[model samples]
Target: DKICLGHHAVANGTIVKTLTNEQEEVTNATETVESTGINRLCMKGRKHKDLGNCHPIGMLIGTPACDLHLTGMWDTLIERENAIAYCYPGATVNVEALRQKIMESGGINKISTGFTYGSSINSAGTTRACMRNGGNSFYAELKWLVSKSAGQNFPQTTNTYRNTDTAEHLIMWGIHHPSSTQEKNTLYGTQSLSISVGSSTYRNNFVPVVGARPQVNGLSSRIDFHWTLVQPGDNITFSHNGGLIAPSRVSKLIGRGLGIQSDAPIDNNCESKCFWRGGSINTRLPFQNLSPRTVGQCPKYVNRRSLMLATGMRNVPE
Candidate 1:
């Protein structure tokens, strides 16, 4: 049974038996393709229905393969919103949907779930998310638990976050010979950045927040600082000589980029700042497996009753 895209033996060999999103039985055994690299296991011209859903395998019907890998998994993602950008550090995948058995809140949109779960400190940088919900849609309180009081509870209804609507980001670049400073901040060399969202009215809830700072610790594409703001149509670009590079991490130049937080911050002092609104404290985190030590650091709040300041710093995981 052939389990490659197009179900064609021409795509690969090795007696494959599984498809990307789903599995099925293969017939008429054939010997392999010419390439060794894993090919794309998605259907073309059908990018819209590819998220959170599964499709049947090739023509040969039988024991279907797993579609989990293709559903919300991404080997690489490049998003452009202005001069600011967003990219997945590793090949990340979404966790299985945790249904609540009730109608969706705030309308009919499905509720969100854990971003792969984290409370132990290992891979919890994106854990314990806080939502911007009230009433029945979602809720939270200042519980006695010093731990439970930290994050939030996602909708958990589970829905597809596809790419159908387009968003725009604004850019602001000054001198510094923008040309001479390309490679220094290049993450994927010549790359294409975009700000796209789902096809719904509540799309604003998922806007991205790109952050940056200097890369002082190591030679990587990640930055030291954190997220700023994520307005529509506002984004950036990274290409060598103009457009072309490879992969690595955190650096001083290009810095790093984050998608967005769940809800804008409410800590008063930081609310006035755009960067603080959609920062790590309470942002929409999905399709990511960011580990802590190697990821984020919780911002320390200074004592201020009348006025609060917004100065978030990057955390070097221990």
Candidate 2:
């Protein structure tokens, strides 16, 4: 007579065999996808049912992919917000530092000393200087000095340098003519100067603070400067010759005062400024990563501050 196992024993053996078969199936599926494609593949091996007090199959699904597949059978889904998408080339500036400067100086208040060359004053009586929470203030009156005419009667000095330690600086110093002829004999080094921010009182004086060394027959003629005060959540931009120019040079100077030096002939209408609140800082998680084994259930509040209070935790890792 043949010796036969009981029904319960046979059922147990079959269950163990099914588990082994499933494991092999998952391994084969992963290898097949990996060998055929460069991208990742979605894999599934089992289904789960939520019991009265526990989800038994949930424990078996160890990975995110596995969990998603098992839940898909029950018409469940996962959603994401603002997921990591693409990378691009760009730059940013400090919002906090810019904000502090505005607050301390009093928003919308005009500087006692005006900018160089009287560029700050528009046809309207109102000075082109005003700061809002998320707006930009304009200043344009600084002059550029060239080596060809250094130590000469350069216009405006004291007011131009005052309180401008943090202002971004750009130099396009060379000798060239403003005319379109572009003839070697008719060459004249044109120094286009404008000031974005300077003392109003000091700006009235058309005197140069510094002079540039003479180059051949070139003399530092005019200096031009322009500034636009940017608050958080505002775009800082520059305009030259009725066109907008990128403020990359100025944006680089957001946290620290930045200066650019060039030997080539400078553009007559070169302008620079910065965008406010262009980036953010990463903060620590307010609560621990909770799972079923740790929390018994998902916490009601998903906010960082609320999670911190609920868990009674402090000093989260960065």
Candidate 3:
């Protein structure tokens, strides 16, 4: 038997057995080409198709001793409209497919899941990324629970709000450095990837009605390369240098689909206006395990209402 993608095995010389009616003994072996600080395991065993799903464990066929080996789990992953293929390092990647995957989602597409975005505190309160359902698909809610309902600059005195009160918020979406040549030349252009539903305006940036204060946030990316968005085994993080950084989060809103939303008060907000603040929230790819995943077969007809609210400012009843 040979090592496959997902099998388990210990170091060589750990076992020796191959019993049957004849009965015989065999010592475990390992490969020399690939070293696991030493050598990978090589064992003699029967090939069972069920083991195909197991992790790697080198095996020897015998003769001069040829070790069957393997590496990363190569697969094609469909990122929304984008398609990403995980070939080995040096394995020619489909550049066009890679380009399209990032481009289609306006760049930085990884099947966003969980709360992919959030905002800062306001007179009303702070709004973390919140989740809602739109029949089939999930939508993002721009609702903030009341924190300071009654304040100097705010009205709406006192009411019985047992963490169940939620106020709607206004969110604006845009990009940064549009005038720059590189900005326009990128794959996604300047369109905000976050979507909004019918008669709904929620994406980046949020403002609480009580405070009459606006908090800015945007999801923009300037990619110089296509593969920049899809690298297996690592959680890729990026930030827009010249814009209001917002908190971001990912949620499993769809079957094998991830939804991400980014919004917040800039890095720093005083009383009057909010100035540009960097490093507000650390953002990363929204894939479940942040590894090579099978191409996503998302549910067709994802309602716009669900799509838009999939990632945006939200109100948490809790």
Worst 10 residues of 1 by lDDT: 98-107
Poorest 10 consecutive residues of model 2 by lDDT?
A: 29-38
TM per candidate comes to: 0.14, 0.17, 0.16
Judged by lDDT, which candidate is best?
2
After superposition on all C-alphas, the RMSD of every candidate to the true structure, in Å, is 31.2, 23.6, 28.8
Model 1 lDDT tens row, 191-307 = 222222222232212211133433322222321111121233332222112111111111111112221212221232222111221222322322122212111222233232222
Q: After superposition, how far is residue 288 of candidate 3 from its true place, in Å?
A: 48
Q: What is the C-alpha lDDT profile of model 2 across 1-318, one tens digit per residue?
A: 699763211111111113234311111110101011111111122121112211211111111212222212321111122211101111113423432332222112112223223332121111112222344221111122222232222232222222343343221111112223121112212233332222222111121223343332132321122233333333222111110111212221122221111112222232212101111111133222221121111222232221111111121222
**Would you give me the overall lDDT of model 1?**
0.19
The best candidate in terms of TM-score: 2
Stretches of candidate 1 exceeding 4 Å from the true structure: 1-192, 199-213, 219-318
lDDT of each: 0.19, 0.21, 0.19
**Model 2: lDDT to the true structure:** 0.21
